Design a protein around this ligand. Structure first.
Ligand SMILES: N[C@@H](Cc1c[nH]c2ccccc12)C(=O)O
Ligand SMILES: [Ca+2]
Length: 342
């Protein structure tokens, strides 16, 4: 009666506070729920859809290390959940090809993320790779190879999983019922704003606070935190609405009555930003300290990182063999000869 959950990330580097708020907290909630069996993909094949230079591919090993350390440090549990490496699941390549054959190109090119990449490519006199166009087909293979029931994804990925549902329906219609139609689990509409107040917090915008930033670094990034540009002087009445300083206090400062007093004094102008910022840094550091302590243990004994990925990959490999046996039984391309050739 247990439902399968699958979600994860391309390995791109260290995790930041936006990852925690936007997706990691929900992944812990799902993992701790007895109704679910969680699979967390480290999607190294998907990095090739945009990063193919040898120097970029070389860094994937490092990115996987950083992902495992951050995931385990916040409590993603490798015995309860299956943390696995996408490229290490041999069946993914064949299921990807099968689904490619079942997906009309016009159903991919209308996906808003793909449409935007295609418009930018044309603008720049480039052409997207066949593999990048196939991004949601490969993601559909990830989800359905696990026969997942529930898929947490960010807003820009929901349409990918809508394609996954259509691929499951097409396969089941043509060849008989094999795949659950996955349900999308939606996140918040507002990703956490970055430290410069310009868009979401992201590695590429260089406006992130990383879960692994040390105390001094958190202090410096909060010191330079974008606030209210109209608050010219320390005595000027300020705006709390839209203000990253108070967006962060609400999320990370547990002392609710202090935050409400700061907000009032800020609107009245009778508080220095240094007071509100020093306290924000103190509370983010207190929030981060237990992560840092566990991450330090994992970095000191990397066998825990290796065991995590070994255990999860072996669990996903088992599931993938069982799923593909069912796929072969229902699709049955050259079934007799492939038996003869086994
Ligand atoms: N597309 C996700 C990674 C990913 C690959 N396969 C998935 C399956 C389910 C959820 C997420 C994924 C990302 O942008 O990082
Ligand atoms: Ca081992």
């Amino acid at each position: 009666k247990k439902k399968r959950v699958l979600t994860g990330d391309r390995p791109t580097g260290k995790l930041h506070l936006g990852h925690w708020i936007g997706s990691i907290m929900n992944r812990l909630q799902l993992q701790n729920d007895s109704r679910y069996d969680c699979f967390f993909i480290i999607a190294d094949l998907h990095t090739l859809t945009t990063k193919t230079r040898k120097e970029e591919i070389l860094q994937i090993d490092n990115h996987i290390y950083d992902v495992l350390a951050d995931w385990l440090s916040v409590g993603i549990d490798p015995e309860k959940s299956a943390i696995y490496l996408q490229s290490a699941i041999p069946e993914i390549y064949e299921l990807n090809l099968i689904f490619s054959m079942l997906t009309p190109l016009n159903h991919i090119m209308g996906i808003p993320s793909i449409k935007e990449m295609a418009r930018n490519a044309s603008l720049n006199e480039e052409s997207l790779s066949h593999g990048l166009i196939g991004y949601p087909v490969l993601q559909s293979a990830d989800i359905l190879l696990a026969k997942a029931h529930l898929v947490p994804v960010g807003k820009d990925n929901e349409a990918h999983v809508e394609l996954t549902r259509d691929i499951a329906k097409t396969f089941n219609r043509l060849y008989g019922e094999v795949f659950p139609e996955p349900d999308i689990l939606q996140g918040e509409l507002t990703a956490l704003v970055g430290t410069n107040g310009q868009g979401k917090m992201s590695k590429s915008a260089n406006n992130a606070i990383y879960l692994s930033d040390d105390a001094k670094t958190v202090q410096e990034k909060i010191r330079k935190l974008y606030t209210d540009p109209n608050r010219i002087h320390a005595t000027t009445p300020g705006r709390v609405e839209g203000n990253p300083l108070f967006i962060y206090h609400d999320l990370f400062n547990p002392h609710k009555e202090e935050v409400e007093e700061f907000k009032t004094r800020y609107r009245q102008g009778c508080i220095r930003d240094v007071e509100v910022k020093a306290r924000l840094a103190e509370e983010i550091n207190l929030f981060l300290n237990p992560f840092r302590e566990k991450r330090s243990e994992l970095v000191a004994q990397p066998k825990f990182l290796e065991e995590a990925l070994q255990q999860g990959t072996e669990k996903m490999r088992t599931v993938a063999r069982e799923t593909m046996e069912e796929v072969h039984d229902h699709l049955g391309l050259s079934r007799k000869w492939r038996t003869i050739l086994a």
